[PDB]
Structures are given as structure tokens and as C-alpha cells.
Amino acid sequence: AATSRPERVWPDGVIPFVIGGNFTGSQRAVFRQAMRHWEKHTCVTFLERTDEDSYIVFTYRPCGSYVGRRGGGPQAISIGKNCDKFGIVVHELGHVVGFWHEHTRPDRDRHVSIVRENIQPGQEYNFLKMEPQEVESLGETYDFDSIMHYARNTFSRGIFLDTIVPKYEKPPIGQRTRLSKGDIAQARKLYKCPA
């Protein structure tokens, strides 16, 4: 679910950043590891902010991110003890780079079923598709292994009640260990990375 909006693509892949206060040294090291992971695989670069008007801020705040470059000022990545692991930060940086959740692709109904009977009442909005004008997938197919893909029981009424079920053979969903091959391939196209 790569944004179609050109102004949301950070210029030349440069993403200035600030790390806020109130983190431990270990937490800060994880933020740097997550940035370096993106930099290893794609042409995105993270730059210690000096005077840039628009930048990301790793912000001590409750868990619960703008997609792409908002512009007009800083944008926060909310980090707490329940959402500070490497793979979670890599996912949040996927939002920063320009990705919505994989299940919100306009073509998602070709790939997953949303099991409405199992969604926690009042949490249905989390499963809305992006409008087709908001996403340009760059010719890359739906990626079950994306770091941006929800797990099978996200916002479910029960641990064993799936809210998202792949439609064909089932691929595991919801990994938060590293960027997938598809994430990388698609980020490279979005940022027009040299190859």
C-alpha cells in the first residue's frame, strides 16, 4: 500500500530525524538499528536534523504514524515500552517512508478475507481499504510477508478468531522481524533507487 501522492515521498530519500528525551540507551540503539536496516536495503537515508522544517521525531508517548512526509513541520513516531522493539520500529518507519498497512491495498480483496464476524465492535475502521487514488502499488503484488501486514487476529474478539484470512495457498501474516523482499522491492521503486 505505497502512497500515490508524490509530495509524501521524502526528497531524494533523505529523512531528517530527532530522537526525543526519556529513552534509555538501549532504546535509542534500537531506533538507530531500525534506521540502519532501512538504509541497508534501500536508498532511504536518515540524517540527524539540523535546520530542516520537516523531520521525524522518535517521541516518548503512548503506543497507538503519519504515512509519508507530512510537511510543514515535525511528525512524531510514538514509542512506549509496549512498542519499542526493532521490528515494530521498522514497521513505523515503513509508515514514515510512505506505506499504509498492506491489508488496505485497493486490491486487497483478491488476497485476503476480512472476517467481519470477528472484529471487535468499534474497531472496524482499521480494516478499511485505501481509495484507489491513494495507493500506487508500483506493479508489486500483495505481500503477505510485509512488515506492514497485520497478524491474523488483530482487533479480534478472540485469540483464535481470525480477522484476516489469506484467500489462497495459507501464507503466514504479521511478521515483525525484518523487511520482506517485497517491502524492499517496492520501497526501491517508490524512491526510484539506483540499481
Binding to Zn ion in span 149-188, by CB under 5 A: 186
Residue 37 is assigned to a ligand binding site? no
Give the nearer residue to Zn ion in terms of CB position, either 29 or 66: 66
DSSP state of 143: -
Determine, following the binding rule CB under 5 A, whether residue 143 of this chain makes contact with Zn ion: yes
Q: In 3-state terms, what secondary structure has residue 59? A: strand
Determine, following the binding rule CB under 5 A, whether residue 145 of this chain makes contact with Zn ion: no
Quote helix, strand, coil % in the chain, to nearest 5.
30, 15, 50
Cα-based torsion angle of the residue sequence 166, 92, 177, 15 in order, rounded to the nearest 10 degrees? 130
Stretch that binds Zn ion, among 23-31, 32-40, 116-124, 145-153 (CB under 5 A): 145-153
In whole angstroms, how close is the CB of 175 to Zn ion at the nearest point?
A: 13
List the catalytic residue out of 7, 39, 92, 169. Answer: 92
In whole angstroms, how close is the CB of 25 to Zn ion at the nearest point?
A: 26
Which residues have C-beta within 8 Å of that of residue 125, sequence separation ≥ 6? none
- Crossing angle for the helix pair 181-190 and 25-41, to the nearest 10 degrees: 70
Instruction: Please confirm, yes or no, whether 92 is among the known catalytic residues.
Output: yes
Q: Which residues are catalytic?
A: 92
Residues near Zn ion (CB under 5 A): 143, 146, 186
Mark the binding-site residues for Zn(2+), compressed into ranges. 91, 95, 101
